[PDB]
Design a protein around this ligand. Structure first.
Ligand SMILES: O=S([O-])[O-]
Length: 525
């Protein structure tokens, strides 16, 4: 395990050499401060995502934390998983700060900062919440398209809004706003996806007057206006005429942004070059993906690939190949990734036969460690007497929703502390949604406790499937709930102060990008 400094990372970013800068702390602390291109991969779930986010075993990986002692453990596990070029960031987070490195809060910062850059450079049109409300009061001919995931749209939405995820905008707009006089308004929860969506439509050159709802659902609430909930308005299937026209416009945008082209043979060649990381991504809807997709491809709906790029393409400097079956979605998404400095190509010449693999994406995993298992009914019997400690590794949010009675929620990254707090037990039984994450924790629990440790066969899902009783709420938390950053732009229970604070934070991103100076972003037109 070597050591790499802020300067080593900065040099690689400027030269655009592949690298993976991983913050191994939990998400909440990550969200308080981290380098622009640092990807968050909590030590707690390192093994579950590393092979997908950093596929090249010899990729220069640099892990860090802020002194918790998580980094050295992460480095060792990576070595044992087969990664040959692992290092610790000199001084950790503080080392980066002390060297003069720029630090950012929140999540998916490159994507959000880029969004602000687009508006700053192209002056992307926007309408105040009050102006849009007036249009509604005037029964104006206008459609409001929500560019977020369908589940976000269902949580809360702008009155009359229609769900049209980011990458679907250029493809579906002609069917939702056929009259060129019809105004098209794009919204999200905050600003990012609304800016990208509005500019996507302008870049594609639609005849309709377009504008982003300024500050989205957050702005709607701050304006004292009313949101709807549980809505189901959504885009529909389009005609071939609509598709062909939009595809021509999209391809032009992609060519303009420098998006590369590839055919199946070209793809195979890239995957044959072991000196580069190549992510094969399907930008269509989840439903289409599961109905049939290219072998080796991962499902990353376009709008979200552009919004949460670091969750998938964690190796900055890597190569991306996008898949779609319409000629619009991949081209548009690629144009944005190109502007965010990514080397990206769109896969051409695909036929219906190429989408042969079916079902949900199966993430690549390392060898599964061995463990002695116990059936749900046996565990129930054990719990009839004291002495059995059940540890739940699922996300704290999931735990609060439903868990095995008496189970203690824990952070895999803080097991020593959790076990001390819980006292002693005659035996431990580990669980999680399916038992997958808990299985990777067996060895550590055995080491720290020196007690018999078992894995619940099938996890909590199996327990529930057995008809056994469950308990909800924060029954017993043996670790602090820092596994998830409370995004001010998700849900409707965030205080107005936090929501306005989120907008203020985005307002300062372009200035921060200037101070960082390693992004290489550019905005076409
Ligand atoms: O992309 S929006 O929800 O901030």
């Amino acid at each position: 395990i070597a050591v790499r400094t802020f300067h080593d990372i900065r040099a690689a970013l400027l030269a655009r050499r592949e690298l993976a800068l991983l913050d191994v702390r939990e998400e909440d602390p990550f969200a308080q401060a981290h380098p622009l291109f640092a990807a968050n991969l909590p030590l707690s779930r390192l093994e579950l995502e590393i092979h997908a986010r950093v596929p090249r075993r010899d990729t220069p990986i640099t892990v860090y934390d802020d002194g918790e002692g998580l980094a050295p453990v992460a480095a060792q596990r990576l070595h044992d998983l087969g990664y040959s070029d692992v290092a610790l960031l000199d001084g950790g987070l503080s080392g980066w700060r002390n060297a003069g490195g720029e630090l950012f809060r929140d999540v998916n910062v490159p994507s959000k900062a880029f969004g602000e850059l687009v508006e700053a450079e192209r002056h992307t049109p926007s309408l105040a919440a009050e102006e849009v409300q007036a249009l509604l009061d005037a029964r104006a001919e206008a459609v409001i398209l929500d560019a977020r995931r369908f589940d976000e749209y269902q949580t809360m939405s702008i009155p009359g809004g229609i769900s049209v995820p980011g990458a679907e905008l250029v493809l579906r707009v002609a069917e939702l706003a056929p009259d060129p006089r019809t105004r098209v308004i794009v919204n999200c929860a905050g600003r990012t996806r609304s800016i990208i969506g509005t500019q996507s439509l302008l870049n594609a050159g639609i005849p309709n007057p377009v504008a982003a709802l300024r500050n989205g659902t957050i702005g709607w609430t701050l304006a004292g206006q009313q949101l709807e909930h549980g809505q189901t308005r959504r885009f529909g299937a389009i005609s071939q005429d609509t598709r062909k026209a939009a595809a021509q416009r999209a391809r032009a945008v992609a060519d303009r942004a420098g998006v590369e082209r590839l055919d199946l043979a070209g793809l195979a060649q890239w995957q044959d070059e072991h000196d580069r990381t190549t992510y094969l991504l399907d930008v269509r809807t989840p439903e289409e993906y599961e109905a049939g997709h290219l072998p080796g491809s991962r499902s990353t709906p376009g709008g979200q690939l552009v919004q949460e790029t670091d969750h998938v393409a964690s190796v900055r400097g890597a190569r991306l190949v996008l898949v779609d079956d319409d000629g619009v979605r991949a081209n548009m998404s690629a144009s944005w990734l190109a502007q965010m400095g990514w080397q990206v190509a769109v896969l051409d010449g695909l036929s219906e036969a190429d989408f042969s693999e079916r079902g949900a994406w199966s993430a690549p995993l390392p060898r599964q460690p061995r463990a002695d298992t116990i059936d749900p009914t046996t565990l129930a019997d054990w719990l009839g007497e004291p002495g059995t400690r059940v540890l739940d590794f699922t996300a704290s949010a999931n735990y609060a929703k439903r868990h095995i009675p008496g189970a203690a929620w824990v952070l895999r990254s803080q097991l020593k502390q959790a076990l001390e707090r819980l006292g002693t037990a005659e035996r431990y039984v580990l669980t999680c949604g399916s038992s997958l994450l808990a299985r990777f924790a067996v060895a550590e629990v055995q080491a720290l406790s020196g007690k018999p440790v078992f894995l619940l066969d099938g996890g909590t899902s199996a327990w529930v499937a057995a008809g056994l009783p469950t308990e909800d709420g924060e029954s017993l938390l043996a670790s602090p709930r820092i596994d998830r950053y409370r995004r001010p732009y998700e849900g409707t229970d965030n205080p107005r102060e936090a929501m306005q604070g989120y907008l203020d934070w985005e307002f300062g991103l372009v200035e921060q990008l200037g101070r960082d100076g390693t992004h290489g972003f550019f905005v076409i037109e």
